[PDB]
Structure formats: C-alpha cells, structure tokens
Amino acid sequence: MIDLRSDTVTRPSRAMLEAMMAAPVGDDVYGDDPTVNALQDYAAELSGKEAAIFLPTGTQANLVALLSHCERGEEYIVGQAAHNYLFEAGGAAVLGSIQPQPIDAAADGTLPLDKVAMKIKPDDIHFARTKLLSLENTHNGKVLPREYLKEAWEFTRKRNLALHVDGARIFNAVVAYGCELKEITQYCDSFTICLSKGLGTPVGSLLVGNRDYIKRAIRWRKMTGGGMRQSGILAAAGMYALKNNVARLQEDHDNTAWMAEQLREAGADVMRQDTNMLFVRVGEENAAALGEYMKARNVLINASPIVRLVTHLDVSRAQLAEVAAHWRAFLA
Amino acid sequence: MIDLRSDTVTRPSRAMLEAMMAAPVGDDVYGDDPTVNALQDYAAELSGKEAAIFLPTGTQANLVALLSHCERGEEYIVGQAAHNYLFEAGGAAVLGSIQPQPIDAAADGTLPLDKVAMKIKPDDIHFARTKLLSLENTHNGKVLPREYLKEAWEFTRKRNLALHVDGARIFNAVVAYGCELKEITQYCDSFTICLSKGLGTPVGSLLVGNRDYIKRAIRWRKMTGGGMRQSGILAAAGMYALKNNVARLQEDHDNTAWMAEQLREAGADVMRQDTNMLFVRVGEENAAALGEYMKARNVLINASPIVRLVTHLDVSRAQLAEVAAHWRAFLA
Amino acid sequence: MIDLRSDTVTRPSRAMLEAMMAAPVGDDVYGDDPTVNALQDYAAELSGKEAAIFLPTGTQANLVALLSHCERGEEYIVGQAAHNYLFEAGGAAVLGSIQPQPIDAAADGTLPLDKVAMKIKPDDIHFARTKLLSLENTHNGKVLPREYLKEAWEFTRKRNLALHVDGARIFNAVVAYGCELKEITQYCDSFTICLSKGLGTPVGSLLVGNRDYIKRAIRWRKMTGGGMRQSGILAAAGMYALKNNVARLQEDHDNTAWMAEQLREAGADVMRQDTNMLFVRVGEENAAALGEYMKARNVLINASPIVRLVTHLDVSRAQLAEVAAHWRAFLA
Amino acid sequence: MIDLRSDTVTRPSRAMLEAMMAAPVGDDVYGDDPTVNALQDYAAELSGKEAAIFLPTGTQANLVALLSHCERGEEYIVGQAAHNYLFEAGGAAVLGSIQPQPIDAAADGTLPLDKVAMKIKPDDIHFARTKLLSLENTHNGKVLPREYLKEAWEFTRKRNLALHVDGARIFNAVVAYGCELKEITQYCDSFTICLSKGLGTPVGSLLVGNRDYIKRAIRWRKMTGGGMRQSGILAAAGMYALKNNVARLQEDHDNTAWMAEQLREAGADVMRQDTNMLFVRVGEENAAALGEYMKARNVLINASPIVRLVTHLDVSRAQLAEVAAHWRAFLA
Numbered sequence A, B, C, D: 001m002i003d004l005r006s007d008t009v010t011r012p013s014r015a016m017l018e019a020m021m022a023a024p025v026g027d028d029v030y031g032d033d034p035t036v037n038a039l040q041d042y043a044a045e046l047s048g049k050e051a052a053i054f055l056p057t058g059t060q061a062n063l064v065a066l067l068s069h070c071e072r073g074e075e076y077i078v079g080q081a082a083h084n085y086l087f088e089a090g091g092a093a094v095l096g097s098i099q100p101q102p103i104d105a106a107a108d109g110t111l112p113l114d115k116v117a118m119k120i121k122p123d124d125i126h127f128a129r130t131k132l133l134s135l136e137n138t139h140n141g142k143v144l145p146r147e148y149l150k151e152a153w154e155f156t157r158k159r160n161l162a163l164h165v166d167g168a169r170i171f172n173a174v175v176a177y178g179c180e181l182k183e184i185t186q187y188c189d190s191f192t193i194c195l196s197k198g199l200g201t202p203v204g205s206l207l208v209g210n211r212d213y214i215k216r217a218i219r220w221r222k223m224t225g226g227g228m229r230q231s232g233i234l235a236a237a238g239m240y241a242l243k244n245n246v247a248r249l250q251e252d253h254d255n256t257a258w259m260a261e262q263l264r265e266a267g268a269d270v271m272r273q274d275t276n277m278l279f280v281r282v283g284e285e286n287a288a289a290l291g292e293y294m295k296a297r298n299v300l301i302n303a304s305p306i307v308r309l310v311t312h313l314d315v316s317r318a319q320l321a322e323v324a325a326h327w328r329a330f331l332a
C-alpha cells in the first residue's frame, strides 16, 4: 500500500514501538508520568523555551494555544488558509469566544506585515481587541523566509502583540533552513510541534512557550479533554522520533523533488514543490478517475483537481517510481 | 451646532417629540405595547415580510439576526469591513459561537459571488458549517446594484444559504433606487432597519423576517438584553420617522453631492460621494489639525487621514456652506 | 385597568414625560449625552461609587455586570432562583462563557455563607475559577437582613471574591431599612438599579461600580447591543424618578400590607407579604379560573397556583379594595 | 508502589502491552484504523447501541456528549457533585454555551425525579431550554438502583428529554448488578465508558449512542481536539481490557469491603464503602500528617479531611494489609 494522501499516515517502526512498550509511565494529570515530563523538558530545552505540554493532537495544541493567548473578546490575526483558522472547525471562535481576523497569505506563505498592520484594531469599543498574530511554518509545505520570521517577531514586539507559530511541520522547515530549531523558535512566544506526521509518531503534538503561559495551557488542555493518564506510552514515541527521525526528513524532501521531476517527465503538470509536498493540477475531469485508478493499484491519493502528494517515511523512492509509472500510464 | 460625525447624531424634531409624548404604551415583554406592535406590523407590511421586532440598537439587531440564523459552530460569509463583522466587537463569535468568514467587498460594495462560492465549506469535520451570507446596504453610503441583490438571493437559494441584509441605511438605498422597500427586501430572508440615524429617531432599530425566524429572535433579544418595557414611546418616533422622514433623505443626498463639489472647489481631495456620505483624503500631516480648527468653529468631524463626512436632517445646506468656507480657509 | 402582574407595568406620569421631552440630549456612544451622563454621575454619587452606566434593561445590566466581573472560565456563586441565574435565559453561561454555581437561598433570601464557602473551588485544573458572589436585594420582595449584607461583604474580601448585588428593587429595600442607599451599597463592589419598575420609568437600568470596572462594562454594553444614541430622553425619566418616586414606595408597601389583611379577611390564603409583593396560594384548581375571572373585570394577575401580587404607583388603594371585593366574591 | 489515589493510576499489564504492540493501525481521521473501528463496534454491540466513538479522555467524552445533546442556550439537569458539572472546569458552559442546572443528588446517588421535574423550565423567553438529564453510574463508587435507572428513562421519554449517563465506572456497576451491560444501557440515549481507570488502560474513553448522535459527536471531537491518528495502539488496550478486565473488578470490590473492615479494626472512622471506593473521615488535625506518614512508607493517598481510597488491579490485598497496618500504627 502506497499512501501519499498525507504524512499523517506514518506508522510506528519496531524500534519506536519498543521504546513505547518499555517507557516508564505515571499519571500525567498528577504530573507523575516520567516520560511525558521528559519529552516536554527536552522539547523546551531544544527550543530555548521554559516549558512544554503534550497534547493528543495538533488541533488541540492550537485550540489550547489560542485559548491561552486570547481572553474572551480578544482577536488573532491569521491566514485565511491557516490550519487554526480554516481546518479546526472554527474552534477558536466557537469554543473560545475569540474573534478571528483572517487575511490572505502572500505566495511565499507569509502574512504581509503591511496587511497585518491594517488589521490591528484601534482601542475603541466598536472593535475586538487584537492580541495575537499567528503563523504557520511550514505552510502547505512552504518554508517561510527566515528574514520574515525575524521581521514578524520585531513587528509584534513593537505592537505589543504575542506571536504564535503553528509548527505542525516545523522540523521540515528546520531541515530545509539547515539551522538549529532554536534559531527559529526564538522568533515566537509559543509554537506547536506535531510528532504524528513526518516525525512518525502514532499520536501527539507539543505546545511550547513561557512557563506561565504553559501553566494556563494546562487548564485549557484539561477542559478541552486532553489531560490523559499514562500518556508516557505515547510520549516515548515522540522522544524516539525527535532523536532519530529529524535528519531523514531530508530524504522525504529529496524524494519529493525527485517525484516532481518524474511526474514532470510523464505528462503531469507540477504546479509546485516544497519540502515533502508536491502539487499537481490534474483537472476536474480526471480528478475522480485518477483517484479510483490509483486506489485500484494500492496507491492512495486525495483525489481532486489539484492533487497534493505528501512524501514521508512510509514511502520509498522505488514506491514513488511505481506510482510515477502508473501516472504516466494513466495518461493514455 | 454643525455635526458631520455621523447621521446617528440626529435629534428629535418637534413633531417627533409630540408623537412620542402622545403614544399609548404597555409592557412589551408581555406583548402589550400598542405602539411597538404597530411599529413592528407596519415595518413588516411595508417590507413584505411576516414579522418584525424592535431593538435598542442596530448592533443588537445584527447580533440577534446572526444568532437567529446560525447555530453554534455554523458560519456566516461577510465583508471584512462590514459592520456586523468589524464594528460590533466580534460579537457573533465572542458571544454567539459563530465562525465569521470575512472577505473583501468589491469597490461597488458587493461581495463577489465567485469569492463567496470559494468560501462555502465542504461538509467535512475540519470546517465550520457555512450557513449565512450577510450583506450591507448601503455600505459606507454605497448603494448595492439591484442586479447583484437579485443575483445574491438566487445564489443563496441554489446553495441553501440564508441571506441577511444589514439595512442600517436601507431607506437611503431605497430613495436612491427610486423604488419601494419591498422591491429590494424580497431578495433577503431577513434585514434590519435603523431608525436612529438618517430617519432621525433617538434610539432604535428593527429586525424583519419570517414569523418563525423572528420568534427565535425574540428569545435572543431577551438574553442579550433588549427586552424592554414601555418602549412604545420610542417606537412612536420610529413610526413618525417612517411616515415623514423617508422622502427627505433625498435632501441629504443632494447636500452631500453639493458639499463634494464645494470642497473640490476649495482644494480638498474628495475621494468619493455616495448618498449621504463623502470621503475626503485629508492626510496624516493635517488630520488632527483640521479636527481642532473645525472644532474651534463649532464644526464637529471625526478627524483622521481620510475623513468621512455624513449628512442628515440636522445639518442644512447653509451650514454645509459655512463648513466649506472654513475648510477652504484651512487649505489656503 | 387594574394591573397587579408586576411593577414593570408602571406608566410615565405627565411630569416624567415633560422632563423627558425637555431633556438636552447627545450621542451616548460618543459620550455626548448630557442627561445620560447626569443620571450616571448622580447614581454614582448617591451610592458612594466612582461610576455608573445606563442600560436598556436590568437583564442587560446583569449580563454586563457578570461579563465585567468574570472572564472565560470563571464562576459566580448565585441563587437557584436569582434573576441573573434563572430568569435571564442562561445568558452568563450561554453568551459569556461563565460557569454558574447556583445554590438554594435561605428563607430570608440570603445565600448561606457556610454554603457559599463549600462552593468556592480549590485552585485546581478540574474546577471552574470562583470569582463572584452575586446577591439579590430585594429578592421576591424580601428585604435581606443588613447584618448579612455586611457579613457577605466581609466574607468576600476574606476570600478575595468580588460581590455583586442585583438591585432591581434596591430602593424598596432602602425605604424598608429607613437608611441611605450608600449604607447598603458600601457592602458590594457593583450593583444594579432598575428605574422601570417601582421607580416608574418606561425603560432603563443602571450598573454602578468602580471606574475601571465600569469602563469594561462599556465594552460589554456595546457588544451586547445596549449602546444607544440620544438615550438622554430615557435617562431624563430616571432622574425624575430618583428625585420624586423613591419615598412613595412606602405607599406601595403600606398598600401591600393592607391588601394582605383584606384578602385575608376574604377567605384568601396569604402565604407571605414583603415590601410591594404579596403571595397567595390559590391552588391548581382555581388558578386558571381566577385568572380569567379577574381579567374579565379589568384586573390583571399572573394566574397560577401561587399568585404573586405586586403593588406600584399605578394601583391605588381604592383599586385594591375593588380587587379585594372581586376576590371575596370569587370565593362563591 | 502502593497507590490508592484513584483507579486512574493503573498501568498496562504485560498482556495488554503485547496486544498493543501487535495491533494493526491506520489513520483514524480517515476512518482507517481497524483496531479503533473494532473497539467501537464491540462496545456498540456490547451495549445494544448503534455506534461508539473513542476519545482521549472521559472529560472529552462528556464534553462532546453534552455538545452533541444540547445546542446553544439549552440546558442539562445534573448533579451538583457530578463530574461533567463540577470536575470538568465548567466546560459545558464555558466552551459549549450550555446552561448547567445542578441539583443535589440523594444519598444513594440518584437525582430525585421530583426535584428534576421542579427544574424543567417552562417554554418562556426568560429561561434556558431544558434538554438533557445527566446521570452518573457509579457515583463516587455508589451503584444507582436499577429501579431508578428505568424510572429516569421513562421520566425523560414522557417529558421529551434526552438521557445521558456518565459511565466512567459503569462496569463496576455492571459487575455489582450481576447483569449484562446492555441491561442497564437500554435506559439511556447515550453513555460513556472509561477504559483508563479500573479496566486498566493507559488512556481512553468511549461515547456510545445512536448513529446520528455519534455522527454529530465526531464533529465535536474534532473541534475539541480528540481526532487522533494511529490510535489503534490505544484502542487495542481497550479491547483487551473489555474482554479480560471486567470480571476481576469483583476483586477490587471485595478488597475495598475487606480494607474497610481492616481500618474499622484499626480505629479509623470508615464513613462508607461502595464498590471500589471507601471513605475515611481522617479530620483536619490529621489530614496532612497522614499524607506524609503514608508517603513515607511508599503509600500514596490524597490527603484530606475525608480521604477517598480507591482500589484497582495495581493494588493487591497483601498491599492493602500493609496500608492497614501503617494506618493502624498511625492512630495508636
């Protein structure tokens, strides 16, 4: 089975499973789970932050981050296509009583600061109270320019606004920058880390930030339903992932870069390629046809006019070759 | 005094006050105020709708309108600069648990239906549930083209979306169209009518729609705090205004077109004139100074880079001539 | 028409109407309404508080007070039968994301402090965060003992909790205590005043408290839809009420005390009498019969097994005699 | 170590861990995890319901259950000491916009139906809309009488209310009843099953109900953050527990009855013993001291005036004998 629908489908390696089954555990609600604590301390330390908290999903990581930053009536400036505005079902507004102020991202994935500036509300009773700027790195595989990350950080300080980064795929960006995680997380107040995508974990995400901030985050995690018990079994996998699966993300990137060239030399229309993502304009007509045609040969893609292919540790290059052949044969 | 800050500054005429002091009243919570009932029946009949509800303000009329249309987790497509998104402190999301989905309006004030369609969410757990399209007529004085109004209605019927129109200045649109109110309200499920701006009432707005919709609105009005007692005294002004203050809106319109030419003559940079509003680019270097200079001559404006001047029954052409002379002196 | 359903049905006297029609007004949103400001300053001054804000209803006065005191996730201890828990449709929870912790009041109308104490939550992530204690004076005509008001005040300071008093009928209690308003409002951080009940106003209520508190209240009043324009027309009536209708509440009380004795000597079962309220156990059977039987002779009561009769300025004693006759005749 | 803090402290048996490491997984968001699907199908079939949904915690299971049953402005009748009212940080109201209506449970843990009926709100705009009755089985170890369960169900059908049962320890009730699960679940619309307490799972709870109800729950799970990926590894433990850890709950029960007698012998004041819980009145003068003394001997308890001791598969009778000896030494 060749699954290119997303990097969320990565399954645990035997080594990861072993680390999981041998991890000492405790009751996380009581703060007695050794492995959970260890994962959190390690993440805080690696990012230059004071604390971190483990969550069941990146969606809850963001929901909690937003609740922790914004009180009732406050607002967050975010992307119209950002995950914590568009793909978390309006959670920040629906459950958190937070006003979202979405704006279109530039082609490079950043939120134009001149545009963010026009959305910062005056301190007048007619408006929501602007409090947070939220970013997303990577954004649809897009690695945000580092100069912008720094400028966004400077700008938010000037405007007394906090800055959050949805880092579901932050390690993909890190590998692509060729720098240390800390050199990019210094430009935010808080950020998330998904362990269940390219890092290969079964479940789990982390929210990282200032001690006091994280303390509030614990309150919100409890209310939203993410305060688990012996979650050390899951956190164990995250530690294994962070110590063994970061560098090979480069293989996912090289594989995507390779596949783009393949599909290219196969009649396919590759719109763009970034880190572990490739976007192909298949078109309305062949969209559903291609979907079934692939699934028939154990190749899974989220069929659509513009298909998003995502590489990861459970897809090898030979497997990409075979999918490339099938795609080159489909065009007949 | 000469007030061009907004049309909300209108004060009761002598005739309106008499109607008020002479109106029969009752407890509106019990549904026993003859004047509120009469006002609501008249507005309903005048617009071709089943029912109407009187509220303390247009803000509450919209908040209640949004709550009546969208249940928790649902979403409304609306303008980035629309009043019930930008100027009501994010009430729909904060208090209502509704996801707002703003988009930029086109220059004529409409929300391009191609963009609205791009925002309708698929029925998938990752998204909010698109339920309503909210419009604004007039929008900063701009009158929406009638063809678009019919187009939006048809568009929403086809896509099973409700259509709400914030009609704070809908009679300014009606007068400008040269048609009957009902000829434009047939293109919406619900709409609001502000009585306290150009129509000259001291307080009050109305929400109009079908009987079932309004019955839900009544519950939301109570909860949000608009369930008043002897509001008949306030409703009486509304009735006086709808019967005696609608046609004269043409005077305000003529006065704004006139003032626009007077200022153009004076050297001011008039950006645009639409119904009872005209926009002047004063610029940052003169913003505050113009505000003080005018305030000195007993002319009140909302100083700002781009000054919005609003006309109404409490500002005459002669007074506008004086303002144009002061402005003229200011520039040179 | 003899209306005993509530004191909310009081209509404006000619003098009140005159004060209303002659009051100088402004735009309250801009803070330019002279009469609104005057009503607020006078109320703050009379109660020893720093500021006050005028609202369309007592319901919005409480909704706003609760929002101003409690942030998302905080909690207020209140009565199971208190108006801002039971009769405002769950507004504090529904719109404000505030957890209500209701408890049964004692027979005297107070919230037993030993009981309030057991409901104050530990600072643990499993619980809502206790922040406010809310009272109600009068509570179903019941005048709360002054010693308790003082003890409740002392207790909340010891527990670092704010204290709010729903004073819809605070002047009835004031008259019954025979003291100055300030001697009872010193035992709370904020309180409300309804002008539209025994005080005789058509619409309106006031929220009073600390400057900073009230400033937040202005934000919430705007969002909830209570920020009106020329509301000086309404506030004028409140000033007239506060300067002319406070002392005669004693007449309502004497009238209630008189009627109790009458209905008593008529076969009626008077359960209790407090200030301007009388409660009669009519029973399931005669409940609906009595309702229609009265309405037939222009006597309006909220028919029920236990009828609540409320006296006020629009009911004279002769009128109570006539209703007493009808009730004594109904028992045949 | 000897942990009597709660049954949530249970750690995976050797057999459970093997089942976990050997379970086939998939992406649960896509509905492709065979083990989650199997767990959900098994629970549904075992309880006579149409569907089930796996969640990270019982808190989320209840939050989602409440959201699925009550729309905004609706209300649930629930116990003042019930977990989804008292111990979930007011989530239903704070995040869900649902009015909670708590009432004291009777000594046997049921909510007296006469009191529940007194709380059903009339259909009037002043009230929240009563929608759900929530129950707790077991409640602090107390098993609800089966006659009451049938009585509540019948009561809610007659009054058109849905019935939810928080079944964190429902198998403790089942074992105590000596009947099949389905014989008690027929008396509710929905119920939860906690897998991480007495059943010995590291994490996880289940919400069970009809297909339509569960489909709405799936949306709320996503929004609140419980939409995990390869949760099959966690679901596998749940399946192992339901098939191998239910009958032994009787051992925990016997151990608690035994420990209660051991402590009575030692001079402790045993308030009550119900299933796997026993309550000891330690008193304020000895609360903290007992906590330290025990913690010294490697026995963990939740020190407090009234200490709640909870038994489970990780505490044997021999260990309970040691605790009884330490306690005995403590007292004299």
Ligand SMILES: Cc1ncc(COP(=O)(O)O)c(CN[C@H](C(=O)O)[C@@H](C)O)c1O
Binding pocket: A126, B005, B006, B007, B008, B056, B057, B058, B059, B060, B062, B083, B084, B087, B136, B138, B166, B168, B169, B194, B196, B205, C227
């Ligand atoms: C299009 C529109 N809709 C709704 C409202 C709310 O009505 P209110 O709550 O009674 O004020 C206004 C108010 N117009 C003001 C104005 O243009 O002067 C603006 C500052 O809020 C408005 O222009």
Ligand SMILES: Cc1ncc(COP(=O)(O)O)c(CN[C@H](C(=O)O)[C@@H](C)O)c1O
Binding pocket: A227, C126, D005, D006, D007, D008, D056, D057, D058, D059, D060, D062, D083, D084, D087, D136, D138, D166, D168, D169, D194, D196, D205
């Ligand atoms: C009756 C009941 N319902 C729901 C829950 C929520 O389940 P969780 O979110 O997985 O913890 C608990 C937890 N029981 C804990 C206990 O008894 O030790 C209590 C502190 O929260 C419970 O006892």
Ligand SMILES: Cc1ncc(COP(=O)(O)O)c(CNCC(=O)O)c1O
Binding pocket: A005, A006, A007, A008, A056, A057, A058, A059, A060, A062, A083, A084, A136, A138, A166, A167, A168, A169, A194, A196, A205, D227
């Ligand atoms: C940028 C981003 N942020 C947050 C999340 C939330 O994570 P959970 O799905 O674990 O809740 C995702 C999920 N990613 C979906 C995909 O790209 O396939 C994501 O891509």
Ligand SMILES: Cc1ncc(COP(=O)(O)O)c(CNCC(=O)O)c1O
Binding pocket: B227, C005, C006, C007, C008, C056, C057, C058, C059, C060, C062, C083, C084, C136, C138, C166, C167, C168, C169, C194, C196, C205
């Ligand atoms: C104690 C109390 N508090 C607040 C309110 C809210 O006021 P509005 O109705 O103006 O929103 C009322 C209304 N009183 C209802 C009655 O006794 O008839 C009340 O009695």
Ligand SMILES: [Cl-]
Binding pocket: B070, B071, B072, D070, D071, D072
């Ligand atoms: Cl809803």
Ligand SMILES: [Mg+2]
Binding pocket: A007, A008, A009, A010, A011, A196, A197, A200, A201, A202, A203, D229, D230
């Ligand atoms: Mg994975």
Ligand SMILES: [Mg+2]
Binding pocket: A093, A094, A095, A096, A097, A098, B093, B094, B095, B096, B097, B098
């Ligand atoms: Mg909300």
Ligand SMILES: [Mg+2]
Binding pocket: B007, B008, B009, B010, B011, B196, B197, B200, B201, B202, B203, C229, C230
């Ligand atoms: Mg006006």
Ligand SMILES: [Mg+2]
Binding pocket: B229, B230, C007, C008, C009, C010, C011, C196, C197, C200, C201, C202, C203
């Ligand atoms: Mg009145």
Ligand SMILES: [Mg+2]
Binding pocket: C093, C094, C095, C096, C097, C098, D093, D094, D095, D096, D097, D098
């Ligand atoms: Mg809420």
Ligand SMILES: [Mg+2]
Binding pocket: A229, A230, D007, D008, D009, D010, D011, D196, D197, D200, D201, D202, D203
């Ligand atoms: Mg466990």
